[PDB]
Structures are given as structure tokens and as C-alpha cells.
Amino acid sequence: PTVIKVQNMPFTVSIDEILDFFYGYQVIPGSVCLKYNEKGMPTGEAMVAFESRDEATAAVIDLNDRPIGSRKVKLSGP
Amino acid sequence: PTVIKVQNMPFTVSIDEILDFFYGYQVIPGSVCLKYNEKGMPTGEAMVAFESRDEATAAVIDLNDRPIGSRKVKLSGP
């Protein structure tokens, strides 16, 4: 269960949205961790893990550049 | 790449406070990831990255069990 990187998120996201964005994918519900900066504000980045390595590879390829609200998100890893 | 987990932080913590905890080490900026469960609630846990294995090992051993707020933080990694 590799973890993948998720960038360029709107800063209006929620945890439900991120998980929904991965609907149909073998994602781990309590694996999301949101990155913030020194000023206490989100950076639009987060880490998300899945049940397998082929499921993380499948997400990155399949959902890269796709949108969460308005922002087209960028995926990488593992 | 060399990330570590942090646990036992009060549920309400700021990044500015966390960075204070890791002063003197090369914590990759913006890498501080706050974790959430499948309910989308604060876990008191985070992930943090360093540039080398050496600095993530150096942080885990020195700072392990020090406070952030009123709790003795627990480090695990790389």
C-alpha cells in the first residue's frame, strides 16, 4: 500500500472530497494527511495511501490532472 | 523521501509550533502533514520529511519524547 502525492488542491477541500475524488479506488480512508506551511495555511498538497501498490499506480495514471472542485490536481508517486 | 510519523501531539497544534519542536534540523518546508481518520477528524498525528536518512534518524532519537504543548511526542522513522 504505497502512498502517493496529490498537489494543486483547492484550499476549500475536505477529507470527504479527497476520498470521493478517489471513488472506485482501493484507497485507505484514514490515510490522508494534509500539508500546511509555517503560516498555518494549507499548501494544497497531501499524502494518500491505498491497499496495494497497483492501486496507487492506477490512481496516479488515471486521475492525474483531474479536478477537485475547480483545481486540476496533480498526482505522483509512489 | 525520508518521512517519519509523529504522535501524541495535542489535537490542536499549529505548524508554527511543530517547526519550533524540530528547530535545528533540516525539516523539508511544507512537508508537515497533519493526519485525519476516515471521519475527517484531527488525530494528533503528523508526518514530516527530511532531506537525508541521517537527519530523520537524528531527529527521531534526540527529540523523541519531548513536549509540544503538554504532551511527550513520539517519533517513528525513517
From Swiss-Prot, chains A, B:
Taxonomy, superkingdom: Eukaryota
Localized where?
Nucleus
Q: Where is the RRM domain?
A: 2-75
Q: Which disease is it linked to?
A: Schizophrenia 19: A complex, multifactorial psychotic disorder or group of disorders characterized by disturbances in the form and content of thought (e.g. delusions, hallucinations), in mood (e.g. inappropriate affect), in sense of self and relationship to the external world (e.g. loss of ego boundaries, withdrawal), and in behavior (e.g bizarre or apparently purposeless behavior). Although it affects emotions, it is distinguished from mood disorders in which such disturbances are primary.
Q: What is this protein called?
A: RNA-binding protein 12
Q: Which residues of the full protein are shown?
A: 855 to 929 of 932
